[PDB]
Design an enzyme around this catalytic site. Structure first.
Site: not given
Lengths: 248, 248, 249, 249, 249, 248
Positions: B119, B140, B149, B239
């Site tokens: 990201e 993840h 995220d 998360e």
């Protein structure tokens, strides 16, 4: 024909019995040289087109072998003076608002190079290009001012927020074939066949009921209008500051 | 040179006379091993870069033959305790806010595998990748926690909301060539040529006036900032709940 | 040993395994679906029922036979030219997408052939697999002369971008499975005989995740999508209703 | 009468010939005690109300001398367990979505203290309160968990983003008169006159054409729905983390 | 004591054992004179506050008889040069972003006139004012530049989009009592009682669990942050153009 | 004076040397009777006002003892025919867009009852009312059609989303003092003092530099424009369907 059909020295208008209106940009019958005059008048032209309910499909095109590849820079006024830039700013917000508010499908027939003001094309619903067409944001990073006139919103929509930013920051040129692969151009045509294809697609659309044409355009432009409205004033203001800075 | 150039043990800084700043992530000169320390310090480094007006173009890269392919998972802290996750949550919001708030063009030079924290790359304006690069959201679904995220926002932006969800849900791997065809990567270079090309593009950009570099970055990140703001805290909170649930 | 709603819908077959993977198959008497006023009214309730049931851990949505949805019984929609009847279609059109999006686990589309109407359902799902005979089109709206305002106006331009998406809708373009794959709508192209096994394979890999992760990954990945649908769905369906009224003229 | 009129042990329904439906919350005919059961069932009831086109105006009210002032905390389930909280989270998103998607005007007749779940009232179009009514967000800061179930969006929408935050952070109580001055309550009535006034306003509304009642509700809730949708999931997720945190220290 | 407590010559920091931090603005012990230096440093101070998890409630206040009523305009730099205004623009975006990102409840104790930078107050959760307090946007229309630094968003959010525009365009002054009636000020106190009351409210808040304080602030600022994000850069850019235009007045 | 000053049979224009423009709605010199003609022409008038940079402050007012208390309902055309309603729909979108795009401060001098089209007032920056003024949404629920022309957005913006819905659903009337307490009206004046006070506020504004007037209006209307854009078309389409339903 309506009075506005002869109100604009840089736009030729022709409309058929089905309400298909071809609006062709020109300078004395040649490819358009963009000027302060077109920057001021084009918003009124697009408003006039949008007001007239007898327009049922619009084709927007240029003349000669370029869609828009020339500009008379000084004719824009002294862009480095904020009191002059404000006119550009106000007209820059109105031109996109008024284009998007054309309430019927709009077909672009891109008849060659589109090196400035390609944001107009990116308001339209069906994009046809002749094989010689090239797209670029030429003028902004040439002058050293922000590409803030709508290209900053519409090119990253068209190409995504990754390739779109690369395209603008590097002044990338896209051929008609590249733009077709990128889903911006929908059909690539020989020069001699572009206008006939535009009219063919228009005649097919014009068989629809009028409210369907109008409300399909409305439904398909809601998100687009919101995105333009989010960024257009800010981009043009930032652009103005960078134009002022050219005096430093 | 500014003090912050020597403040971050996992970032090397080099800046030329044109204000082109290369920020290279490393772990003792090797490819970065991501840690609780980098998760905490990177937001501050990106803030520091953004504050310093002498930075006119930024190149963000890794070291060795991977961009980021390793993580020290214990060093993140006990993610299953919400009081510890809250540090990760606050820092996860700040890292992307601060990275986006760099106010000049940012070029990614992706020097190999980017299997976590990709990201960061998806905040940048021009993305160059070495031919050995691969992109994946590895950690993840390996851990059983939400990809929340920022990858949940930015990968569907980059690939669209169809392929982007497929990519995340199946932990798809993309080669540099696949990423180039998907318009995420803009140029694919041999490993030995990547940094030279990054600097070439940067030197061309650096010839622009400073305010134009800054305000073109502003104009081109408005929508991106809004979209990250919309989803980043919610993603990180979800998360966190799935991290707590690892105890069950 | 199965929920009552599994046998509540004459046009949906339900099958769920021990891992919580639910296959929902649209059909008309075991054949490819003929879309009706009945399915328009009932499908929103089915999707709600699916979303409420926490024993659903991954969903596979598919059709029957060699088409996903290629047939409609027009009269059965009701008198769409009367706004009092269109208002049923309007309310149900808002609910069907809201309820489908609110399924709170990953949803896989197994597109088993032509999707000529209601393809917006597919465009709510997370993983899109298609058999090689699949074609996508918005067939019915411009054939009838009414607005493509039931969600296709939002989701096709989201999938294809706001340029090709508008061309696709205004010209009633047909996309093949390979075309859709290159356009990032379809993620895998399979022979017809292998489509369902691949859907189930992907689902079994997902179902190994913890349950809250499946649910919250779906939530995180659909926030922006839900906002975009909510922005335009009611307006599209109201405009569509006006064009339906106008058919009387 | 529809089957759903007798489906909910905590809701009494009656409807007149004008399609005016009164929905009254109760526990054995007394003021409501909120439970895990009502948290699960009320979203389905509000959906049922919204589906039934025979409802032309809705009045939502409580019983006895309080609108909602009691809760059975244990009946909510182990909120500190994220797998149990997830049920509350899903139901908390659905209840406001479904309440807002009632597609006719909704009148609140607030018959006394509203100390929890006052967000329901803040979805409605016309708010009437008896003189004895008091508003408060009581339970969240008493339990040490986030006021994230919609009050965080709707109270700042009602009182503004300054007084609304003061009201939530300090657990401020507002009398009926204070709420009237703050434009939240629109008329303050004696207890014995509240319901008659609700019905009076409803009967005046019911003289409107049905599609006008429905579409005026839609037009007047578009922004409200967007604002709820923006923050409801996030609020409930944050609230869940604070419920988990009660196992710490 | 953290190092940042003594990093800012214009901010005094004092924190108790409950994590209640009072931050007091001053110029060498007197009411604050706003400067180019405070414009540059305050965003870093607010960031530092927000980073430190030992801050559990924050009280923001001024010194002496005014909250902020003086400015050293020359110390702002040559605002007429866009290269200098750009520092003000960047800092003007950062100050509100960083102030809003304080992740615990913030109490304003407004100790007298707030004639500039009152947008800081309008990021906070609980607003207390001394009886002598007056609010005004003084400097912008006195100079001839846009009130584009966040007052253009937050005053119309506090007063609504009608009175908020009247207030800005006419440089209206509001007393503490007027602001209280307008729901901006929540309690009006004698000067000698203001700080004690801020600390009383803070001690009550500090009894909450830490994550609840943090996540209630997050839930209650989501919409506020979106609204400031929407308009702050554009306002400051417009203001910059009018600052350039001061050369032509 | 500009040609548009004498182009509208229902608007009188007067502008002073400071660029303060008073625009007064009238029917033959009397209080305005709203017509299909004004519905069509007012969007063009507000566009014309917005285009003219010599307008530095605008005062919008009515004539006689009412701001707008009467409507020639039949002159609107056959609202039950969607092909005729589409004219009203298009013009209803344009009138608010064009009024909001006046790029200088706008003062409402409300000279009496405003029982229809009060959404015009709710675009303006400073609202002064004579003591005889009353506000109401009279026509929609009298006709049985949706209050979807902007009142559905702007009255709940002015009064909040609780009192605003009460006001619309019950056709509540608000006096000048009630509106003042609700922060909609900013000053209440005797009828004979209303215009003098409008001009006094205007002359104070007009001492500002021109760009400051323009850009303060821009900054203070960004959110308002977004909110109007969000709901105006949907409200007018829903209203159209209810107008069609009057045939049932």
């Amino acid at each position: 024909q309506p009075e506005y059909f002869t109100k604009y020295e840089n736009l030729h208008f022709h409309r058929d019995e089905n309400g298909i209106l071809e609006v062709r940009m020109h300078t004395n019958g040649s490819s358009l040289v963009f000027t302060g005059k077109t920057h001021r008048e084009f918003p009124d032209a697009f408003y006039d087109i949008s007001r007239d309910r007898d327009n049922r499909v619009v084709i927007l095109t240029g003349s000669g072998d370029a869609w828009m590849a020339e500009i008379d820079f000084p004719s824009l006024g002294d862009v480095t003076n904020p009191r002059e830039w404000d006119k550009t700013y106000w007209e820059g917000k109105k031109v996109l608002q008024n284009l998007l508010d054309i309430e019927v499908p709009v077909i672009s027939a891109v008849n060659g190079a589109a090196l400035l003001h390609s944001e107009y094309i990116l308001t339209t619903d069906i994009i046809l290009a002749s094989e010689n067409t090239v797209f670029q944001d030429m003028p902004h990073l040439n002058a050293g001012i922000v590409p803030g006139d709508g290209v900053h919103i519409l090119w990253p929509l068209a190409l995504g927020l990754y390739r779109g930013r690369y395209f603008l920051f590097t002044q990338e040129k896209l051929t008609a074939q590249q733009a077709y692969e990128l889903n911006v151009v929908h059909e690539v045509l020989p020069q001699s066949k572009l206008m006939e294809r535009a009219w063919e697609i228009a005649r097919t659309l014009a068989k629809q009921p009028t409210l369907n044409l109008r409300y399909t355009r409305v439904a398909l432009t809601q998100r687009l209008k919101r995105l333009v409205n989010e960024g257009i004033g800010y981009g043009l203001a930032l652009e103005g500051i960078t134009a002022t800075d050219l005096r430093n």
